[PDB]
Each structure stands twice: as C-alpha cells, then as structure tokens.
C-alpha cells in the first residue's frame, strides 16, 4: 500500500527551528511530489509547500523565508525544516501525496506530527490505576506530562471495545492530564489481566500499568 | 488567495437522513474543489475530487455537485460512522486553500449515563496529591452536571471535565470529572461524593465512597 510515516511529536523552543522527516513506501519519490500541510487553531488547514519529483520546491508566500524542503530519493525520505517558530506555529503538521504527480488532491496523508512551541521543559507522566449489572469500569490516570500527546492502548491493542480515552486537559501547573477507561464484564476481572500501555514519545516514557481490583 | 466559506458551522441530523454541506468561493473556481473528512484524531481523508468525481474506497453515499462559487457535498443516508468534520479545498488558484470546515453531529435517543467513582490510588497518595475521578459513561445528549461534595461540603473550582467526541458506533458521549485535592486535605475528610444530573435520569444519581 501507499504510506507516509512522519517522525514523532515534540517540543520546539520559541525562535528555534522545526524538523520533520517523512518516510514513504508503496511509491518512489522520483515519481511523485510530496506536499506539506499544517492544521492550527488560528488558521485551520494551510498548504505550506511541496518538493516535486525533480527536486524543485514551491513554498506558500508567508513561508518563503523560513521554510526549506529536501529529500533523499534512495532512502525514500522527505525532509521538512522551518526556521524561527513562534507560538502560533503550534499546529499539526502533515506530509501528503496527491493522486497524480502534478496535482493537489491529497489522497494519502502522514499521521501528522503534533508540534508544540514552548519554552517549557519536557516531562513524562506518572500512570496511576483507576481500580474497578455485571459490568465493571476500570482505567488509567495519566498525569502531569508536557507536551501533548500521549498514546494509550489496552492489552497491547487487543482490547478496544468499550475503551474511552478522554481529551487531555491542561492543569494550572501547566502540565497535562488525561484518563483512559474501559468497561468489562465483572466476572472477567478474575481471569483476564488488564494493562494500559502508556506512551509519551516527547519524553520517551513508556509505562505499562496493570489495573487490578483493590 | 481564494476565501472559502463553509456553512453552517455545525450540522445536526438524525441517522438515515440526507445531509448537505455547503462551500462558497470568493470568486469563480470552476469545478476545482476537493472535499475531505476528518475523524477524531485522524488525518484528512479525501472523499470527492473536482466537485463530483468519486474516490476509490469511499462509500457511494458520498457525492458532490456545484460549479463556479457554490458547491455541495452530500450524504444521502447518514450513518453513525460519518460523525466528523468536513473540509473543502480549492485548487483553481495558487495557492490551494481550504475552508474552515463543518462539524457533523448526530441526534439519537436519550441515554442516561452509567456513573462510576474512583478513589485515589495509594500509589498517587505517596506523591502528595489525590485525584478522585467520576465517570459518566455512554450518555446522550451532551449536557450533564457533576457536583462534588466532600463531607457534605460543596466543592468548587477544584475539578476539571473532559468529554469524548461522539462515539462512531452508538453516538453517545462519555465524560470524566476529576476532583484534585492535596493529600493533606484528602486525609482530613471522609465521604467523597459525586452527584450526576442528566436528562435521561428521573432524579440525580450519586456515587460515593468513604476513604478507607
């Protein structure tokens, strides 16, 4: 299949530069253009620029001075770099490929890189258990991390039905907090193990928290 | 640049209903418009290119029409998995620009929340902070009240709520309310209660525990 896989989410200090790598498969960079698009609260979806099959680049007008796109065809890699970020450059960045080599209808997207522009320090979360008509609820409290995001899954991806992972909320401390719950048959608490797999890529903190009835 | 005006901002319909999204351009752009779907935590998914041309793998219930300045994305029989935001994009004029999007919401029957309360873990208490969590699961519609009480005293200002987007399958919401106390305050009191008020309950529901 055609895929685009971007590098991981992260913090960038104000006035520093942002770097993202797009690694592609299921097509050759010599045959297609790779576009960059971002998505911000203040401006929604903006098209940023593109590198073509032949290496030419076009940058959207507000970004000509601070934007640079490069690639390594052999490694199937596209390199995005933007200079002097300010806080309203906090956004989700995406690479994308059009349906046809010269066009702009984006049928394939990368998973997006969430970029936070802040002078703050990275901090991994602590994970705490939320301990459990025959339906029990249980979960994980994922507390005090910066920046967004954390991924949470259950039993390494095998448990998904009934799972709710809430939107993160910013505490007064300036750190985020989030809970993830799941409902299960109470009779299964005796025989099944439940683990939430927490992953905070910006701090490289990976925790598996087993959640048992207290 | 071409300004693209999508309307309305929020669309609310019931399943099985036809629904239409509008996208107006600031000057004629021919039929050079593309439409996208974005689901909770997703990247945009291409639904329609050039006003009306179909996309491989996209359900046949999606179609588009229009030419010039006024365009329309249609869903003939809305499903629950269609809960999402919808965006138009023009490419008649460089640079390509996107609209601000339309949010699609689905009505359904009233569903009372299931309420669960979780005391702080002893692990967290070692850290000098206590989080008490109250869960309202699978309810509709979104309006709900969570009221915290500690030893009959009303808590105010020390709680935060988070609400899921609409479930793609049953169209319900879920909500968490977290009460945050210092370990000292938590150790000083006994009865921790969260009272939940919602349209699907004939009276408010309280879940509570006694510390220890």
């Amino acid at each position: 299949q055609v895929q685009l896989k971007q590098s991981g989410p992260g913090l960038v200090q104000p006035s520093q530069s942002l770097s993202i790598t797009c690694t592609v498969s299921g097509f050759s960079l010599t045959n297609y253009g790779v576009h960059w698009v971002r998505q911000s609260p203040g401006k929604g979806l903006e098209w940023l620029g593109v590198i073509w099959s032949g290496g030419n680049t076009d940058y959207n007008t507000p970004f000509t001075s601070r934007l640079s796109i490069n690639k390594d065809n052999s490694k199937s890699q596209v390199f995005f770099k933007m200079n002097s970020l300010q806080s309203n450059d906090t956004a989700i960045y995406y690479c994308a490929r059009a349906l046809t080599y010269y066009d702009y209808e984006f049928a394939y997207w990368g998973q997006g890189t969430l970029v936070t522009v802040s002078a703050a320090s990275t901090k991994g979360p602590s994970v705490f258990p939320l301990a459990p008509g025959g339906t029990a609820a249980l979960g994980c409290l994922v507390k005090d991390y910066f920046p967004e995001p954390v991924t949470v899954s259950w039993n390494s991806g095998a448990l998904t039905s009934g799972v709710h992972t809430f939107p993160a909320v910013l505490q007064s401390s300036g750190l985020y907090s989030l809970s993830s719950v799941v409902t299960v048959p109470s009779s299964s608490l005796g025989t099944q193990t439940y683990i939430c797999n927490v992953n905070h890529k910006p701090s490289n903190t990976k925790v598996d928290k087993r959640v048992e009835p207290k | 640049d071409i300004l693209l005006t999508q309307s309305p901002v929020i669309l609310s319909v019931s399943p099985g209903e036809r629904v239409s999204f509008s996208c107006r351009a600031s000057q004629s752009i021919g039929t050079n418009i593309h439409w996208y779907q974005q689901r909770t935590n997703g990247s945009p998914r291409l639904l329609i290119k050039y006003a009306s041309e179909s996309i491989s793998g996209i359900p046949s219930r999606f179609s588009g029409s229009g030419s010039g300045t006024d365009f329309t994305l249609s869903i003939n029989s809305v499903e629950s998995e269609d809960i999402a935001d919808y965006y138009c994009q023009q490419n008649n004029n460089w640079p390509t620009t996107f609209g601000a999007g339309t949010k699609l919401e689905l009505k359904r029957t009233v569903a009372a929340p299931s309420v669960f309360i979780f005391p702080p873990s002893d692990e967290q208490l070692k850290s000098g902070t206590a989080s008490v969590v109250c869960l309202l699961n699978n309810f509709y519609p979104r309006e709900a009240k969570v009221q915290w009480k500690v030893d009959n005293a009303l808590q105010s200002g020390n709680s935060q709520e988070s609400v899921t987007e609409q479930d793609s399958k049953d169209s319900t919401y879920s909500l968490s309310s977290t009460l945050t106390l210092s370990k000292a305050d938590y150790e000083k009191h006994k009865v921790y209660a969260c009272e939940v008020t919602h349209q699907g309950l004939s009276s408010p529901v309280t879940k509570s525990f006694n510390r220890g």
Binding site: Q39, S40, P41, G44, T90, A91, I92, G112, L114, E148, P149, P167, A168 | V9, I10, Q38, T40, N41, G42, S43, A84, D85, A100, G101, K103, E165
Partner: peptide, 12 residues
C-alpha cells in the same frame, strides 16, 4: 468552530 489540537476536531 475552531480546530482543537488535542482531538483534531472542531470545537465550539
């Protein structure tokens, strides 16, 4: 609506 980075959804 306005785009929310946490959920990638519009929020009013």
């Amino acid at each position: 609506x306005q785009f929310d980075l946490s959920t990638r959804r519009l929020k009013c």
